[PDB]
Amino acid sequence: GFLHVGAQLGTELFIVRQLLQIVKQKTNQNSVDTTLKFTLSALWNLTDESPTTCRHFIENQGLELFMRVLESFPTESSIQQKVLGLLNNIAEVQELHSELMWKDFIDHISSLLHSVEVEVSYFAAGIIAHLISRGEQAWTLSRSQRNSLLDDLHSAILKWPTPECEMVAYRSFNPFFPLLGCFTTPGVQLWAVWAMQHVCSKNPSRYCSMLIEEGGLQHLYNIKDHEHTDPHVQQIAVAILDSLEKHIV
Amino acid sequence: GFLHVGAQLGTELFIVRQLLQIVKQKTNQNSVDTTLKFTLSALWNLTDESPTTCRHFIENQGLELFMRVLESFPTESSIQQKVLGLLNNIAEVQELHSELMWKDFIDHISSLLHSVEVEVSYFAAGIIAHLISRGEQAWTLSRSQRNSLLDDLHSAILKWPTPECEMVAYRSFNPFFPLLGCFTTPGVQLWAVWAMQHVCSKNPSRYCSMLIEEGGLQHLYNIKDHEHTDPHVQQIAVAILDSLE
């Protein structure tokens, strides 16, 4: 039994508030411990495909707190990964895009894009890819920074080695599909196809069938068949398609 | 995206541990505040039909903490209801029965059965009903206490007024069905039919179709036609049936 009809949502939101309170306490104490790491993991996990949780995070000063986490722990790669992983989930929510148009936030993300650790850079890239995908008018910060970020995003992806593990898990590829259509901003497409390639090659039994079942073949074929595709985007799309085509047969 | 495949279970259990830490802190501070009330609500909600969450609660000293809560806040009805609501969920898990065969725990439940507030007594009665339903050999405490609890359970239910609103929500009636067959312990059946009548009369659009779809009618018919049925069990069972037929 439980408190009342509908009470589970109120409990979910309370849990988010209390996890942010732990983050705040650990950050105040400059204490990187197991509790903080499990707390950042939990918030990342709870924001997965959950606009309701993403919104509640924003409304409880989560963005400011998480910038404080990055400033307080600049040498903690695993902390940065979990912070950025959550923020990548926020960045997928179009209704929250305006909440991320904050110079202190974008400047932190832009700098972490240049981390040599792929486990950090990858999520900074995902945030930027989603934000840039929404178009120049949706971008209410400096136009010059948006244009620079476009090039930095493209160049950063091309430097990444093959990571040792899956850096992330996905329940669905649906959030990536709008990115695959962004022909006028190739770095956005490049992040999406690199991401799909990474998880499909690491874990094809989980992800290849999922990608096909959700309609990924048509989206990838539309990139391949597009006349004037960025050469790096085209190459990863073709590489993914070859794997997928062998998977169906 | 999320941490790694299968990570949500580890997050769920961590959340339980951290909610228990909050209960411990508020009890240490003697602070009946909104955060404590939401934390107890959260734990109640998280143990709903969740044997794995109930076990984790037990393994992180939840039972002793909740006894301490009951001792620290002896006249806080809202706190007592939320503590007992969670414990009612534990009492539903057969595999955890022996963890509740603890004299100090049962003495607390027995005391709350005698609350003048039905919103507290109801959940103490639920714990007792589930624990008694498991039979005499599973009851490893005093046989004398089992027999008095069975009497006290029956008489408590007969005193309850109609509550002002639904005291609890359920996702399923399935945990009540084993209680409906306990003809040799009528107080256990009485709690189960009283509880069914309560939610069906307060919220028929949610609960009447649920009862029907899950096979509740056959259990009530079983009671209606059984030879030497306790009259109060019989009356409510017939009232529920007649409300549907």
From Swiss-Prot, chain A:
Species of origin reads Homo sapiens (Human)
Q: Which stretches are transmembrane?
A: none
Indicate where this protein resides in the cell.
Cytoplasm
The molecule here is called: Protein zyg-11 homolog B
Q: Outcome of altering residue 44 to A?
A: Complete loss of N-degron binding
- What does the UniProt function comment say about this protein? Serves as substrate adapter subunit in the E3 ubiquitin ligase complex ZYG11B-CUL2-Elongin BC. Acts to target substrates bearing N-terminal degrons for proteasomal degradation with the first four residues of substrates being the key recognition elements. Prefers Nt-Gly but also has the capacity to recognize Nt-Ser, -Ala and -Cys. Involved in the clearance of proteolytic fragments generated by caspase cleavage during apoptosis since N-terminal glycine degrons are strongly enriched at caspase cleavage sites.
Alphabetical keyword list: Cytoplasm, Host-virus interaction, Leucine-rich repeat, Repeat, Ubl conjugation, Ubl conjugation pathway
Assembly, in brief, is:
(Microbial infection) Interacts with SARS-COV-2 protein ORF10.
One cellular component GO annotation, for this chain's record?
A: cytoplasm
Consult the record and explain the modifications the protein receives after translation. (Microbial infection) Ubiquitinated; leading to proteasomal degradation in the presence of herpes simplex virus 1/HHV-1.
GO BP field: positive regulation of proteasomal ubiquitin-dependent protein catabolic process; protein quality control for misfolded or incompletely synthesized proteins
In UniProt terms, what is the effect of altering residue 89 to A?
Complete loss of N-degron binding
Task: Name the family the entry cites.
Answer: Belongs to the zyg-11 family.
